[PDB]
Design a protein around this ligand. Structure first.
Ligand SMILES: CCOCCOCCOCCO
Length: 132
DNA sequence: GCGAACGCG
DNA sequence: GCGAACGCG
């Protein structure tokens, strides 16, 4: 069950696809540790993907040993694969999110990390803390 | 809508 | 064995 000294992340979208953001919070406190400026077009899974990787980079900067919780099978897998498999068309209106996703892929393939990435078990625990 | 997890040849 | 037909915001 829950490791409380941990960071939780979640994505939110106005439309899917649409404007997406994300945040990370302290799983115990609910303290908002970071939040990303709105991105004009993205998907839920892209947003999540950026969120996990932001967290990874947040924690590593700080030499944290805390784990990250995510409720996304997909984003978790993409992170473990160091490869994002989004179906989102690449055009003028999606270049920003795709630049962001590629760079985070790049980061994952050019760096190591200690952080355990753990499934937030929603049926048992409720809404992950980082939900909007 | 996003992406992962039965029937054919 | 291969390809078509859940959890979360
Ligand atoms: C300026 C406060 O430091 C925040 C550290 O987080 C850095 C995250 O880097 C961007 C990851 O995509």
């Amino acid at each position: 069950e829950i490791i409380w000294e941990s960071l939780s992340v979640d994505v939110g979208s106005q439309g899917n696809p649409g404007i997406v953001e994300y945040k990370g919070v302290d799983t115990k406190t609910g303290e908002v540790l970071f939040e990303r400026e709105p991105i004009p077009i993205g998907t839920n899974n892209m947003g999540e993907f950026l969120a996990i990787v932001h967290g990874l980079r947040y924690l590593k900067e700080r030499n944290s040993r805390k784990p990250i919780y995510s409720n996304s099978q997909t984003a978790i897998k993409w992170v473990k694969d160091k490869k994002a498999k989004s179906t989102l068309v690449r055009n003028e209106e999606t270049a920003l999110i795709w630049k962001l996703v590629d760079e985070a892929e790049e980061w994952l393939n050019t760096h190591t990390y200690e952080t355990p990435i753990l499934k937030w078990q929603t049926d048992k625990w409720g809404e992950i803390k980082a939900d909007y």
